[PDB]
Amino acid sequence: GSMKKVEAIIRPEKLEIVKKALSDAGYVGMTVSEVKGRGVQGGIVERYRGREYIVDLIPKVKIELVVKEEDVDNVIDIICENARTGNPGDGKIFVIPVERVVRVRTKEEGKEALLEH
Amino acid sequence: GSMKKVEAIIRPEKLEIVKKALSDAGYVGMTVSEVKGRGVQGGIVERYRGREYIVDLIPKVKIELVVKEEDVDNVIDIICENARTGNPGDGKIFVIPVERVVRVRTKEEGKEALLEH
Amino acid sequence: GSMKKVEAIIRPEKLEIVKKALSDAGYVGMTVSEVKGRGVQGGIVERYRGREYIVDLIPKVKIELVVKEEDVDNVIDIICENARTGNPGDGKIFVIPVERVVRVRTKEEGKEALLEH
Ligand SMILES: Nc1ncnc2c1ncn2[C@@H]1O[C@H](COP(=O)(O)OP(=O)(O)OP(=O)(O)O)[C@@H](O)[C@H]1O
Ligand SMILES: Nc1ncnc2c1ncn2[C@@H]1O[C@H](COP(=O)(O)OP(=O)(O)OP(=O)(O)O)[C@@H](O)[C@H]1O
Ligand SMILES: Nc1ncnc2c1ncn2[C@@H]1O[C@H](COP(=O)(O)OP(=O)(O)OP(=O)(O)O)[C@@H](O)[C@H]1O
Ligand SMILES: [Cl-]
Ligand SMILES: [Cl-]
Ligand SMILES: [Cl-]
Ligand SMILES: [Cl-]
Ligand SMILES: [Mg+2]
Ligand SMILES: [Mg+2]
Ligand SMILES: [Mg+2]
Structure with a gap:
């Protein structure tokens, strides 16, 4: 696992x-960063606070959740269901491998570093 | 992929x-974050907006682009050619595997999630 | 490796x-970002500047260091020893594969891009 x-x-x-x-x-644990971005070109022009970010990067937030592999589909589904609006700029999700996890306080690793105690 | x-x-x-x-x-899609950093030991000491940074972390910007593997060399070439100044502190590039990409609005995945409208 | x-x-x-x-x-090369986060539910409620946080995310700092695989254990040890306090909220470390490293100024790829010249 x-x-x-x-x-x-x-x-x-x-x-x-x-x-x-x-x-x-x-899925409680998460790290959040303030970022700015743009997505793909073309189609309907993205709007933020009332029509139009033609050239500039648009404010977004980055959420990072480290989870067991078996929980990834669940997490993505929950994010998409709750984040979407139907307009361009709703977001993008990337899944990245994590080879090790260590809890700082205890030096526990792996599964136990992700578990409610 | x-x-x-x-x-x-x-x-x-x-x-x-x-x-x-x-x-x-x-390569339009990108996520940009404000950071501060240090590189390897040595090099002429960095100045930034008038202030010298002998020991302290120096302002930088992080750009993240998720792309098809076949495009990575092109992206690297572009970043190096345009980011460089010839002085220490010009930057560093890391290539990290992405196992899945999902567009929030539509649930499109893979190559389709990177494609332009 | x-x-x-x-x-x-x-x-x-x-x-x-x-x-x-x-x-x-x-381990001199590093990138630092301001973030907010929460860990796992349960146990002692996290406190920050005189109040409990449960729904709200707590200020943290992210430090990213790209190193050789054979340096990871020592880096993790140094972080845990120095970051820990014994109260909930001390931190978490994730180890992520990096396939390629390039120095912007020089276009050097690999091992040398982590070294003083
Ligand atoms: N390829 C990518 N690499 C890095 N970040 C990206 C990429 N694509 C999108 N992003 C980030 O996700 C944000 C949201 O993108 P956005 O929702 O516009 O995606 P899209 O692919 O254009 O889909 P849509 O048509 O629904 O807008 C961007 O502002 C950026 O921060
Ligand atoms: N090994 C590393 N891990 C994490 N971030 C790094 C690492 N090396 C560099 N960085 C980040 O890249 C920024 C720029 O580094 P810098 O350009 O000084 O690299 P360098 O290896 O010292 O090359 P140069 O000789 O051109 O200065 C740093 O301020 C930091 O944010
Ligand atoms: N699963 C996770 N995914 C992403 N970020 C996480 C995760 N768990 C923790 N973090 C980040 O690490 C920070 C510190 O978490 P924290 O120290 O509360 O971990 P914990 O597992 O609850 O251990 P402790 O019992 O020692 O509090 C969080 O505020 C968040 O930024
Ligand atoms: Cl000291
Ligand atoms: Cl390890
Ligand atoms: Cl990453
Ligand atoms: Cl380095
Ligand atoms: Mg878009
Ligand atoms: Mg340098
Ligand atoms: Mg905690």
């Missing part, structure tokens, strides 16, 4: 609901 | 040139 | 002592 990092870039105003939904499902 | 995350740490004043050159080559 | 990213999330007040202990041991 391996571990994975789910790295989701989502709208800043979706952070609270996504983190509630993840938490309600038992 | 496969997909890769190109994570480049560059000078803050090189964001605009690098973003434009990447865009002009088709 | 291979290269790894050590991604450590620690308390903001521990940045100074942890970075100095790393650089004293030769």
